[PDB]
Chain A
């Protein structure tokens, strides 16, 4: 009901919006944000954090360019 196991994710406000945008884009193939809890913390589905870390890192690199 009101209880979920998961991963608390600490991120800066910029990557808070990235996480929200990336979840909104469904860009891992699935929704991964459980909910936004603060400007610096988000609760996330543990299975997709494994993919999130890579795709965020690659997209952080890609965002550097062009």
Chain B
């Protein structure tokens, strides 16, 4: 029951629905006359909230008033809600019933130990020209397309592929993620990617062991049916909410079967350009991670980052990349839409 799709009140037994449909101010459609009057009439024996930690007071108050369910159960990712603000709406549901300790999940392998790391890549002199000169947000590509960041990304991906670790690569920009995945010759998914073209990749990643690394647009910041992976790398450490980043990180990362004895059986990477606006979000992520108890480290260089064949090894290819970045418009350099 959601205006994005056809719905079936007749003989329903479990209505699964979207708050923004139900907490409307005024009817969305005749389909709201169909369902909302019907839903206002039903008395559900139990209400399950999957994202109560994200719903605003007004939408929750409207929903609770409309349904009047006999029991309500609030499911949350984190106790502190981004919409908690002055009033903790949790009391509308009731006390906290239980809290699974991060240590109990890690000690029992339910949630893998995630290696949080940041590749603090030194800024390239040429990119530094453009970084300080470009005060506008077109600067985003400069920290994102630094050869140091690309070469480190390429190595670690090929490393995690050698380990046959399922890995997903995420970025804040269309051109950046495209140029990476294209030059790396790896799958990339975007909004225009048709479901069959998308499923071809997903099935060959979720089940076929050949595809170890896939590239996913900023859409991964939200529900885009992201697959399961053991390693995640942020091409940009620039990003939004720390909790939403942490939510995404846990959503995708899964314990690598049989590797729990290793230092880590899950890995997270976020790539950082030194002396750039990325370092604050990097620092705040670093802090928020250690605050949340996650293990963290910083990376600058590791074996193979220069001992292996990696792109842009010559000044000209670096120049072509930088000129292609400079020739790209602000739109191609701006933050990729999330949808």
Q: Do chains A and B touch in the complex (CB under 8 A)?
A: yes
Write the residues of chain A forming the contact surface with B, with a CB cutoff of 8 angstroms.
12-18, 21, 39, 60, 63-66
Leading 5 A-B pairs by shortest Cβ distance: A17-B128, A64-B279, A17-B125, A14-B123, A13-B125
Q: Which of A16, A18, A64 has the largest number of chain B CB atoms within 10 A?
A: A64
Instruction: Give the residue name and chain of the B residue nearest to A25 (CB).
Output: B132
Q: Is the CB of B277 within 8 A of A18?
A: no
Q: B122 at interface (Cβ–Cβ under 8 A)?
A: yes
Partner of B128, one of A21, A60, A66: A21
Instruction: Give the residue name and chain of the A residue nearest to B133 (CB).
Output: A21
Q: Is the interface of B mostly helix, strand, loop or mixed?
A: helix
Q: Is the CB of A16 within 8 A of B125?
A: yes
Instruction: Give the residue name and chain of the B residue nearest to A16 (CB).
Output: B125
Q: Is the CB of B129 within 8 A of A17?
A: yes
Q: Is the CB of B122 within 8 A of A12?
A: yes
Cβ < 8 Å to A, chain B residues 93-151 = 122-126, 128-129, 132-133
Q: Is the CB of B129 within 8 A of A21?
A: yes
- How far in angstroms is the closest Cβ of chain A from B101? 34
- How far in angstroms is the closest Cβ of chain B from A59? 9
For residue B276, which residues in chain A have a CB less than 8 angstroms away from its CB?
63-64
Instruction: Return 11 A-B CB contacts under 8 Å, by A number.
Output: A12-B122, A14-B123, A14-B124, A21-B133, A60-B275, A63-B276, A63-B277, A64-B280, A64-B283, A65-B280, A66-B277
C-alpha gap A13/B126 in the complex (Å): 9
A63/B275 contact (C-beta < 8 A), A17-B129, A18-B132 known? yes
